[PDB]
């Protein structure tokens, strides 16, 4: 009945585009209805707020309500149910009547989908009647009003697709708040850190750059996480007092020490948050978008990738580059989104560079292991693909890595069945929806490009093809040095091993097998070495040049026909 | 659950064989139960009606119910299923109990296949339990009914094979409502047009001949379409009366004119439906099921020798099935047309199909070959599966030498499996026509008598025949006739077949469009258009 005059517009930031639409669609036909009365125009606009969960929908609808000043009727869907089938409609009939009786008025149906789901699956009689009562109540607004003191019903929900189409048709105005951009997140961070003590090194613009895919709720956790880091020094001092009072692992003792006193509360000095604590806070906070379905960042760096300079240049100029400098690349017409289909013989490093790109781009990473999205139920197999891109867009920039993609988009022959074709078509449409300025970088890897659909390789789709093939003799030297370096002979002996004619067809995996064979040959030599020198555990196994000599003899290339993989 | 005395026996026709069985299997153990009572034997008969959809299954069960007069309980299978799993059996247990409580009674389980499906593949618990509930409710009828009165269960379904064998066994009487024949469709058409005013030219036998593959529902649309055409004259007269009363587009005014009077009613003269409107109505109505070709003998030029052979082995034994059957002339399963390609083998097969008024299916060669072990033979069997259902039907296998090669030692196991399937189906009102240009490669078991043992050679025209064909082609699309003689007698058409002459006419037509285009930059088909058409058309 009264506005909630405790949250203001200043407390909600980053919604500048959303607040612009809400000015001419909610505020105006609630306070300046006289102009509409002079104009003679009924306002039947049902304003619907939708977007990712945590974007500040509930808070905004309460901040707007407190600012407009007109009578406000907050409605919570679970609180509508009282304990009787007929009483549920009584609560709804007591809202649309009260708003009409107290027009102009604002109705907020928070979590509308909790009582406005799909009626097709609504088997229960009570559930299907609440939707009918709600939808009829909107027509009464258009009828029982002077066409001047309009009543606007505002509904907020994080699942706009769950609304009954009988209801969503009645909500003409739909406001997609979406996720805030880099400029918007800076505004939120400044707004959030307004009652706190801060240092001078805090660059909120820098903080916004390295928090992609965060929403207003997620940015609140980053501030909250940084506050805890600011109090870390005030806990160690509290721990030290407990240690000095008392003459099991260390963390357990800390709980036991603080459990002891529980009454001798000591003053926490009022320190301020530095910039180093904010960087620590961002790492500790996982955004709500990255909670589910996002793979862990691989441990592979460019130091783990030997040679492949041509592939590295293409990857550092099409994916890693645009992620680091989205403005430098967009000046030369390089859009911050790409689709790359890595292909080549097996064992040559297609997955290795994709794991290095995911790790060297510092961006979000989603990995799909072949036909991981297929499900035995109807529609759920296709919904997984659509939901896959529903989070890749929300967490842009994001890297989608389809490993062994020939199993997910096979050639649409007669022997395909009406289950994977429905997924290939869905995957084709989603790749079309990936905008040039969307921020999704799709990487595909397959070792049999002759079995992958040719429709996936068109522009807009995975139209960029990078060939990863067998290394040359000079190329294997970089790879063999890279492999030996990452496991610890020096580097001059590695050139002799890699340039040997017995490694003519070796791929990247074969060179790794060569090193493992030499390592096993060392241990066999060590086992006999420690039996002649002993009959004390001080034996030193070291990979010697003679171990490489017998490793070259017993290792053959895993690739049979190198030219079999150059045909597509 | 009272019997509706709405649809009568007169309103259901063409079921004379069906109505004879239903008299001693439904009427007797519902009205004359006393005779069973004296003998002391309950008569429990579950009558099952099945056939193509639209054959008049639902209507028959309601016409019988209204004539018997006993209590009737219409049951629709989808409405039995309720929101709760246990409520579906509740609906069924409230039916078989009600019939027992209200014996004698008639139960109509319309669309039984919607719930009495095969519980084997119906692995879901509710699906497999409806069938069990149905079967137990029928046993209680045999057990708990009195000796005096019987309860008859009538089931209708268009897919009798989908029924659970535990259920189809409970329906002893099965009536397969096939599709009506020419004699039967005439009875249906007369029954539908019984309360209407008709003219004298209406030949119901002619209507039945030119409506093959139609069912009772389709024939109701044909009657409904002809009735609307019959009222077209009654609307123009109605519009003129409104115009004469009142001195915005025209259709809007017509609505406004008729809104004026309303309560003021003027007489509609009682006109009658002619036969020409019935012929128009049939064309406008597309049956749910192929279609008689539009090619007549006026589209076929010359080929009189081929026509006589075709008019004596196929076309004749269709128009007068009794005149030919009087002298012992069985309708040969078909004709094996052969000759060079492009000479009118498919054209004449479409002409035979049109002067026979039967359905036509055309195969353009090896369309039936499949890489699988069974689908290649199933395509041939499905070809004859529809041909029987739409009898009379003409099956035309064009370039049949790729579908039935000679079963020599070098044949493998893919074409032999197709020849055998085709041989058995030809043994099983279907007129199969085959065409091939290499008769030395077709199996000799096909060309035996009873199978396609009649061979008619359709070959290249010499010179006079092309004149008739070119005149025929030009006549059906609208140069005069003196220029057509010059075109057909030109030495450049030495090897032209029927298709080449058709290609020649299209080339001349295209040459006309080039002339119109240049005329409008600075239409009658002229001789100069034929001049450049002769150059750009080859016999191939």
């Amino acid at each position: 009945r009264t506005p909630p005059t405790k949250v203001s517009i200043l407390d909600i930031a980053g919604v500048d585009d959303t607040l612009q639409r809400l000015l001419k669609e909610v505020w105006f036909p609630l306070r300046g209805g006289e102009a509409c009365e002079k104009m003679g125009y009924r306002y039947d606009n049902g304003v619907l707020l939708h977007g990712p969960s945590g974007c500040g929908k509930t808070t905004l609808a309460h901040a707007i309500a407190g600012s407009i000043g007109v009578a406000f009727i907050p409605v919570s869907a679970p609180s509508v149910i009282g304990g009787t089938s007929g009483e549920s409609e009584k609560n709804i009939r007591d809202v649309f009547d009260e708003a009409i009786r107290l027009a102009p008025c604002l109705i907020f149906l928070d979590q509308i989908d909790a009582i406005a789901g799909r009626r097709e699956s609504a088997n229960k009689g009570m559930e299907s009647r609440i939707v009918a009562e709600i939808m009829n109540g909107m027509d009464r607004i258009r009828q029982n009003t002077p066409l001047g003191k309009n009543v606007v019903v505002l509904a907020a929900t994080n699942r706009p697709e769950f609304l009954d189409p009988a209801i969503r048709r009645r909500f003409s105005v739909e406001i997609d708040m979406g996720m805030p951009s880099e400029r918007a997140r800076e505004q939120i961070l400044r707004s959030l850190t307004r009652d706190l003590s801060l240092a001078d090194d805090i660059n909120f613009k820098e903080l916004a750059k390295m928090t992609p895919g965060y929403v207003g709720s997620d940015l609140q956790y980053v501030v909250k996480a940084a506050v805890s880091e600011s109090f870390q020094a005030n806990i160690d001092s509290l721990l030290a007092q407990a240690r000095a009072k008392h003459p099991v692992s260390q963390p357990q003792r800390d709980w036991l020490l603080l459990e002891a006193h529980r009454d001798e509360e000591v003053s926490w000095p009022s320190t301020k948050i530095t910039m180093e604590q904010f960087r620590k806070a961002v790492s500790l906070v996982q955004p709500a978008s990255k909670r589910e379905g996002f793979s862990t960042i691989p441990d592979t760096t460019w130091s783990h990738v030997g040679a492949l300079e041509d592939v590295r240049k293409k990857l550092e100029m099409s994916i890693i580059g645009p992620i680091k400098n989205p403005e430098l690349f967009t000046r030369v017409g390089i859009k911050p989104a790409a689709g790359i289909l890595l292909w080549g013989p097996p064992g040559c490093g297609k997955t290795l560079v994709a794991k290095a790109v995911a790790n060297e781009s510092k961006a979000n990473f989603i990995s799909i292991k072949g036909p991981e999205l297929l499900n035995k139920y109807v529609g759920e197999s296709e919904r997984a693909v659509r939901q896959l891109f529903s989070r890749a867009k929300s967490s842009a920039p994001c890297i989608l890595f389809f490993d062994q993609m020939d199993a997910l988009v096979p050639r649409r022959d007669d022997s395909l069945s009406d289950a994977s074709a429905r997924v290939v078509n869905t995957l084709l449409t989603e790749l079309d929806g990936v905008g040039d300025r969307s921020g999704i970088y799709v990487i595909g890897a397959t070792n049999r490009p002759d079995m992958i659909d040719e429709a996936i390789r068109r522009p807009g789709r995975l139209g960029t093809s990078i060939y990863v093939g067998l290394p040359s003799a000079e190329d294997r030297v970089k790879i063999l040095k890279t492999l030996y370096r990452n496991t610890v002979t020096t580097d001059a002996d590695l050139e002799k091993v890699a340039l040997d004619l017995r490694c003519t067809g070796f791929s990247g995996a074969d060179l790794g097998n060569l090193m493992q064979a030499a390592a096993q040959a060392c241990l066999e030599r060590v086992y006999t070495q420690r039996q002649q020198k002993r009959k004390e555990e001080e034996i030193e196994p070291v990979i010697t040049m003679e171990d490489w000599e017998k490793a070259l003899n017993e290792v053959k290339p895993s690739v049979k026909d190198p030219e079999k993989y150059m045909h597509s | 659950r009272t019997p509706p005395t709405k649809v009568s026996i007169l309103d259901i026709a063409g079921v004379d064989d069906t109505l004879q069985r239903l008299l001693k299997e439904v009427w007797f153990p519902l009205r004359g139960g006393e005779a069973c009572e004296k003998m002391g034997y309950r008569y429990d008969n579950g009558v099952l009606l099945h056939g193509p959809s639209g054959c008049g299954k639902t209507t028959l069960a309601h016409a019988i119910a209204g004539s018997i007069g006993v209590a009737f309980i219409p049951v629709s299978a989808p409405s039995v299923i309720g929101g709760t799993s246990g409520e579906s059996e509740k609906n069924i247990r409230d039916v078989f109990d009600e019939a027992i409580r209200l014996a004698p009674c008639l139960i109509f389980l319309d669309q039984i296949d919607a719930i009495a499906g095969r519980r084997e593949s119906a692995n879901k618990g509710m699906e497999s339990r409806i069938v069990a509930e149905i079967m137990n409710g029928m046993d209680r009828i045999r057990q708990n009914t009195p000796l005096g009165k019987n309860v008859v269960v009538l089931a209708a379904t268009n897919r009798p094979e989908f029924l659970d064998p535990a259920i189809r066994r409970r329906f002893s009487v099965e009536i397969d409502m096939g599709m009506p024949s020419e004699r039967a469709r005439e009875q249906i058409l007369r029954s539908l047009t019984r309360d209407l005013s008709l003219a004298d030219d209406i030949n119901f036998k002619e209507l039945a001949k030119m409506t093959p593959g139609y069912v009772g529902s389709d024939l109701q649309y044909v009657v409904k379409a002809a009735v609307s055409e019959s009222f077209q004259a009654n609307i123009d007269s109605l519009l003129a009366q409104a115009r004469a009363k009142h001195p915005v587009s025209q259709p809007q005014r017509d609505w406004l004119l008729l809104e004026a009077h309303r309560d003021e009613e003027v007489s509609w003269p009682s006109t009658k439906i002619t036969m020409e409107q019935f012929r128009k109505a049939v064309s406008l109505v597309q049956p749910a099921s192929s279609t008689i070709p539009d090619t007549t003998w006026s589209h076929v030029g010359a080929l009189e020798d081929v026509r006589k052979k075709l008019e004596m082995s196929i076309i004749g034994p269709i128009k007068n099935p009794e005149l030919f059957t009087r002298v012992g002339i069985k309708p040969a399963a078909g004709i094996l047309l052969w000759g060079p390609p492009g000479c009118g083998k498919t054209l004449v097969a479409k002409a035979v199909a049109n002067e026979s008024k039967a359905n036509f299916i055309s195969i353009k060669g090896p369309e039936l070959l499949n890489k699988y072990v069974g689908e290649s033979e199933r395509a041939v069997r499905q070809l004859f599966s529809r041909a029987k259902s739409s009898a009379p039907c003409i099956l035309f296998f064009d370039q049949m030498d790729a579908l039935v090669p000679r079963r020599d030692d070098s044949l493998s196991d893919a074409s032999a499996r197709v020849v055998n399937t085709l041989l058995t189906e030809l043994d099983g009102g279907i007129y199969v026509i085959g065409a091939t240009n290499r008769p030395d490669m077709i199996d000799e078991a096909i060309r035996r008598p009873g199978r396609l043992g009649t061979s008619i050679y359709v070959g290249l025209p010499s010179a006079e025949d092309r004149v008739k064909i070119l005149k025929t082609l030009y006549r059906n699309t609208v140069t005069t006739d003196a220029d057509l003689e010059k075109v057909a007698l030109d030495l450049r058409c030495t090897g032209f077949s029927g298709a080449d002459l058709g290609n020649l006419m299209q080339a001349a037509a295209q040459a006309c469009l080039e002339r119109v285009y240049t005329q409008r930059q600075q239409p009658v088909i002229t001789m100069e258009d034929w001049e450049k058409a002769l150059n750009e058309v080859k016999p191939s």
Binding site: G83, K376, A419 | -
Partner: peptide
């Protein structure tokens, strides 16, 4: 009024098949 727990129908699934080739 007391809301009781009521069982309902089940979802449908997909089944893969194997098809022979005469070639």
């Amino acid at each position: 009024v007391v809301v009781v727990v009521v069982v309902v129908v089940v979802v449908v699934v997909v089944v893969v098949v194997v098809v022979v080739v005469v070639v």
